[PDB]
Write a protein that binds this DNA or RNA. Sequence first.
DNA 1: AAAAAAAAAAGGCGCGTATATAAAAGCTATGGAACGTT
DNA 2: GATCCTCTCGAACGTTCCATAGCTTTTATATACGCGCCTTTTTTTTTT
RNA 3: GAGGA
Lengths: 112, 180, 88, 85, 46, 49, 49, 138
Amino acid sequence: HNGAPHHAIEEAESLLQFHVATYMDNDIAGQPQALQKSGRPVKSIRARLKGKEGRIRGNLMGKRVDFSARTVISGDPNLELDQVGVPKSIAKTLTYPEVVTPYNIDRLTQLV
Amino acid sequence: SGIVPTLQNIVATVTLGCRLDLKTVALHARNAEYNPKRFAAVIMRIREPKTTALIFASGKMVVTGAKSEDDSKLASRKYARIIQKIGFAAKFTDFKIQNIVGSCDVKFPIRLEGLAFSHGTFSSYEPELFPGLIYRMVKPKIVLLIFVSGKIVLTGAKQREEIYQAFEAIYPVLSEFRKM
Amino acid sequence: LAINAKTITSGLKYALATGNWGEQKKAMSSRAGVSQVLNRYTYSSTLSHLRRTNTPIAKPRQLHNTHWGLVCPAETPEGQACGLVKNL
Amino acid sequence: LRMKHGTYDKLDDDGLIAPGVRVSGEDVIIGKTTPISSKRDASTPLRSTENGIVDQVLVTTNQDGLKFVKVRVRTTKIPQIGDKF
Amino acid sequence: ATLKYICAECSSKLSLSRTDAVRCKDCGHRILLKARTKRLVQFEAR
Amino acid sequence: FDMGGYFIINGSEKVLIAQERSAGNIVQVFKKAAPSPISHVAEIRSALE
Amino acid sequence: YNVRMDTMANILYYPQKPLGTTRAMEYLKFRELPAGQNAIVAIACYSGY
Amino acid sequence: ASILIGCRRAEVARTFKEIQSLIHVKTKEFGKTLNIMKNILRGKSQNLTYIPRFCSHLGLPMQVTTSAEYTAKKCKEIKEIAGKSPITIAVVSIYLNILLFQIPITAAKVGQTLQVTEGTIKSGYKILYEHRDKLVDP
DNA sequence: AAAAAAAAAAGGCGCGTATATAAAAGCTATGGAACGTT
DNA sequence: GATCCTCTCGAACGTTCCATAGCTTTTATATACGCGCCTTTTTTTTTT
RNA sequence: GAGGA
Ligand SMILES: [Zn+2]
């Protein structure tokens, strides 16, 4: 609107196009990478999803969950084949939600 | 407080309302001085009152070097007449006080750095540059040049009380930022 | 008069502290991996650290005969880097 | 308005714990607060897992003139059922 | 004496408010130690 | 017992891993695979020291 | 170690030089800064634990 | 102006002459500009630091510097021409300490190093020798 | 031996520093112009 | 593409030339305190 | 960086 030096228009047009481009994908081949004030390129959307800890493989096909624990294991020949010796402090942390029925209400009262 | 900032000078411009002949004044007048290569201003001074007449080609005459308003005026009226004494039809027109330069002393060092940290809205000490402090009071529009020796220099005024009234409102701050 | 020492100073320092051999403007194009943090976990670990050796990127992971006597035939961080990192 | 819910009682007025004090849990060891410009807490509790003794507390100024503090905590580790050898 | 800081280098004593943070006044050092408490810490002989 | 050989940056002791690289100013000859048109190559990556 | 102030220091209580050494360990100052102890080990199936 | 602002605020002692040696400011328009800028920032909203800088520039030890520190501390309470641009007072306190000591940094080197008067130092020293009474710590 | 000369500087104000007014007369730079120039 | 987990880090150009305001011109003055630089002061020096 | 396995 403010006067059109007819071929700075392209100089800005291609700029805008490039911006949108790298925004949706910062990894266009044969290109600069849109860097961000740090040297680290910009994490375009497309790279937010690219495999192996994109959204998909990293947050949908597998995620990180609650109610779990992790520790070193140790053999034991006094455990039934299907048993597992969870250490006490862990069990002090993981929980399981019971539902209060007439069958347990007393016992649950004791627990609480 | 109660210290009168004595006017170290008073400036006053008076317009002769004419056009002299600058070479004529140089040859004819006795207490006259005027150099073209430096600045086209007639350097006219009278022994009583001892001021200077900054006479330009346009009849603008400035009276500086007195200590009071009327001495800078009395010299001007003498200044105009001696120009008339040359043989011109000069006229004593458009007299006005230009500036009142003034200083005082307080006999005690002032914490100008103290003055600058709390009254930095108003103080300015440059010990590496200016051994005084610039304390510009808005009302009246007077600048207090505040020295470590105690020299509170005041100028930028045409009112005699304006220098005086500004100080009376600033001494407690100097006592605030004083040492002993 | 007006020589930017900070150029050399900060440039050297930054490069060391990160190990991106290149320029402070070079983020990834600068080669990295040099200048680690001197593992001081156990005296001998320290010693070993100071004599380590790297190879960027031909069967370079192999143990060539010419390594005889120059590079430890045994010590190497098996893993991805097996065979690349070497020790004198 | 940002109390860490740990235990500030250990440290002294300078937001430091004198060495030799026993600590544990997430007791704060550095009491650092930030102006809001009342002021919110930005302390540094020690790791929630561990405990031990404050060993030696060093106070100094940064390169640039910022006061800054290092704390060292001592702890004895006895071999246990799972440790590796 | 009761104590508040130790110069690291001079290994003497010192006391300070929230004033300076440095200057083992003798050596003028810049690192000070926090002058071990007196809480008579308790220990378990095992 | 400290043996030196490292730098102190920001108060954290850093150490420069030796980097290995091929020798300069050395002529080498390589066969090339069948798909290529060039059967052999002699290369020399001359560089000023 | 008690003067350095760095992250994550681990110090053995009562190190011991090994009984079976190699000549070179002399040059590594190993027998002055050993990194383990001599346990009386017994190789046996004791209780399946 | 803003550079001296930053240095003063972060407690860094800097000379107008040093700043001008950095930047051609003509120093008088600089004085006016710093005045107006200070006033502006005061609307928008402690001289001891200079000693060790010059102590270092002349290569002087820390006990000498603390002797100078105590001397300058008493300088404020020893009007009797105490400061009046106390940079001269700092440099003369330094001269007092070196003359108390046996250091071959005779006035020429210190003056040419700090760009100070070779005469204002002795002008201060005149009253300094009388003032010697209140300067003995140990 | 004795006269006379040759020459450093000491100390004092140079003015000069800043500080602040107040005055328009050689010079500067800013501010304005649009028509000569391809 | 190229496993698995912790966890650390940061018409445009010239061209001419009017039109804005300044600046800088000396000169009054308080202070410190800077070189500036005169002169005599004061020596050192040379010759008789 | 670390890195165990
Ligand atoms: Zn000390």
